[PDB]
């Protein structure tokens, strides 16, 4: 058969593509990874033949690797494809943005010589730009996984709008639980304080999943981050700490004088 | 109870006309979509089960760590 | 009156969000900045009450202040709103990603006491991740306008997927009119060589605008970029030039070592 | 007629996954099946529709960013 991975956006029902909605209607079987029961109910009304992929996350009494969690999810998706089924995976937001199951399933389906593609969806950052009235192109944009930013060497350009994703579990590890989330966020604040003042206004952003609720747009000084209540759906926005400065080296090459830049 | 809410929330998130009428008079628009006084109140106050499900943050975070920690 | 700015995505008719489509359907008047006739025809059949904003771009040659162009676009939008009309402003992709008109119109509508908001849409960024099966979260993601990267001081993180938008007009200026465009891209190539070797594989990406066309995914050595044929719709993807390295200082604060990651 | 026929078809094809799967199977047959002429089918199959008048406003956007950060 075939595999199409689609995003449903973040808002219930309205934030999906006309085309992506069409793929779900006509799918023989749908594998879902949605964040709440309302969007699970909405999907099931679109196409009754839904398999819910979060049964593959560690349940009560289990400890499960990310490797085995995803392997089991991909295997289940690939079984329906192997059975000659027109299979559609329905993920929230964009199925390939800060998510690897869909990329993994598509890689494996092609390897076995089946037709597999990804349809772009409206991700959390796409929602952020709209809700905060910020243009990522204005002074540029950087996105990092919060924990990756702590464990590995990422040097941010503080002229840009910086997004730290999965901020709630920043630095989390079964060996770093002697530190509280507040303790880990304090360590992250010390690290960010290398480029950003402790009084630098940051924004805790949570796009609305329902049409009856406003998004969370909590502005606060960087120093107060460790005391913030954070959810699995929290994204941290760190606006620019620095104005853009002319690149005098490259202007000189081009033959432009800074006063000739309007 | 939640079966009616779910069906009303789906229409509201899809219809631009319903989204506007709702903004103007949410109570009256929910009455007209056959929603109980219990349900209206729960929506107006924000005191309503969100039906949040197990997020995969920890599995995605851990997978990223295991990927670049192999070198 | 009210204002709602929506995006139509990059693919004709199918990449618009179900709710964004409905806002267009129900709008008293629609101001369009769609790039081509096919999307203009599609919009027209959805809602005949269309005013083209493309008219406000410099018409008799090329000496207009960009701030004036956008000032007039915003003014034409606000005049429909000021007349008590349900106004919708339809942009391609995401109305707020590497575009300023919608943010400007919404800012000034808000400031004049009118209901104004932006509905997220599917951007060229979002199509790139799907079409190239790349996760921006994998090693992080950076987006810069190519010309802003040359004229101003940006530091790329070569562990990340780096996007240079508007790559075709990299370094365009009245003072660089007589530059041959390969000359301009050669300077960009030299600049980038601080972080990226000359044989480093880069990708010229162009998301399909029509359903009968497949995307352009052109792989080539960074060194050959000045010889490349580039379109206004071209985006340059620069994959990582470096593996992620362990942040030993932050790891020690957390009480774990590299060996604990994996 | 020529351009109207292509626009209606493209619009349908871009919105319907069923139709889009068929078009990938038999492009000529599906287009022929939707009342498109051989001239229309020819414009599509190894022909035009791309590289035709577009206006993405990149110049005015790059200039705006330059003068808004030009601090002059
Ligand atoms: N409602 C929401 N508001 C803000 N960020 C959100 C969000 N839902 C998910 N996220 C972000 O996404 C992370 C989970 S990873 C999945 C992201 C999803 N593919 C997307 O396209 O958005 C969260 O930790 C958070 O950083
Ligand atoms: N079809 C396409 N494929 C790839 N990149 C594209 C594109 N159309 C526009 N772009 C990118 O966007 C720039 C124009 S700025 C407008 C961007 C639009 N708001 C969006 O959401 O995508 C181009 O110079 C290019 O970098």
UniProtKB/TrEMBL annotation, chains A, C:
Residues 3-213 form the Tetrapyrrole methylase domain. Keywords: Metal-binding, S-adenosyl-L-methionine, Zinc. S-adenosyl-L-methionine binds at residues 94, 124, 166, 207, 232, 235. SUPFAM superfamilies: Tetrapyrrole methylase. S-adenosyl-L-homocysteine binds at residues 94, 124, 166, 207, 232, 234-235. One of its GO terms (molecular function) is metal ion binding. It comes from the Bacteria. Zn(2+) binds at residues 125, 141. InterPro entries: 4pyrrol_Mease, 4pyrrol_Methylase_sf, 4pyrrole_Mease_sub1. Transmembrane segments: none annotated. Signal peptide: none annotated. This is TP-methylase family protein. It comes from Shewanella oneidensis (strain ATCC 700550 / JCM 31522 / CIP 106686 / LMG 19005 / NCIMB 14063 / MR-1).
From TrEMBL, chain D:
InterPro entries: LigA_sf, Xdiol_dOase_LigA. It comes from the Bacteria. Residues 7-55 form the Extradiol ring-cleavage dioxygenase LigAB LigA subunit domain. Signal peptide: none annotated. This is Extradiol ring-cleavage dioxygenase LigAB LigA subunit domain-containing protein. It comes from Shewanella oneidensis (strain ATCC 700550 / JCM 31522 / CIP 106686 / LMG 19005 / NCIMB 14063 / MR-1).
């Amino acid at each position: 058969g075939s595999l199409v991975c689609v995003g449903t956006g973040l808002q219930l029902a309205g934030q999906i593509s006309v085309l992506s909605r069409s793929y779900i209607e006509h799918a023989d079987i749908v594998f879902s990874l949605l964040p709440d029961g309302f969007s699970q109910r909405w999907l099931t009304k679109l196409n009754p033949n839904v398999i819910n992929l979060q049964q593959f996350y560690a349940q009560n009494g289990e400890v499960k690797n990310a490797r085995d969690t995803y392997e089991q999810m991909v295997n289940a998706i690939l079984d329906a494809v192997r059975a000659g089924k027109k299979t559609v995976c329905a993920l929230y937001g964009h199925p390939g943005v800060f998510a690897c199951v869909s990329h993994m399933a598509i890689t494996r389906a092609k390897a076995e010589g089946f037709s597999a593609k990804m349809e772009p969806g409206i991700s959390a950052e796409a929602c952020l730009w709209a809700d905060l009235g910020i243009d990522p192109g204005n002074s540029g944009h950087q996105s990092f996984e919060a924990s990756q930013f702590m464990f590995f060497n990422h040097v941010p350009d503080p002229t840009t709008h910086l997004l730290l994703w999965q901020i709630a579990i920043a630095g989390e590890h079964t060996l770093t639980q002697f530190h509280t989330s507040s303790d880990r966020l304090q360590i992250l604040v010390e690290q960010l304080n290398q480029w950003y003042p402790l009084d630098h206004e940051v924004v805790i952003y949570e796009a609305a999943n329902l049409p009856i609720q406003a998004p969370r747009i909590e502005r606060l000084p960087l120093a107060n981050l460790p005391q913030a209540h954070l959810m699995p759906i929290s994204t941290l926005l760190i606006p620019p700490a620095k104005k853009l400065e002319y690149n005098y080296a490259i202007l000189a090459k081009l033959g432009i004088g800074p006063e000739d830049l309007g | 109870h939640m079966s009616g809410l779910s069906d009303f929330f789906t229409q509201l998130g899809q219809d631009a006309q319903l989204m506007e009428d709702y903004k103007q008079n949410p109570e009256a628009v929910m009455r007209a979509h056959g929603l109980t006084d219990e349900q209206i109140n729960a929506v107006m106050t924000g005191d309503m089960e969100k039906l949040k499900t197990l997020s995969g943050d920890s599995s995605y975070q851990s997978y990223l760590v295991i990927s670049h920690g192999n070198g």
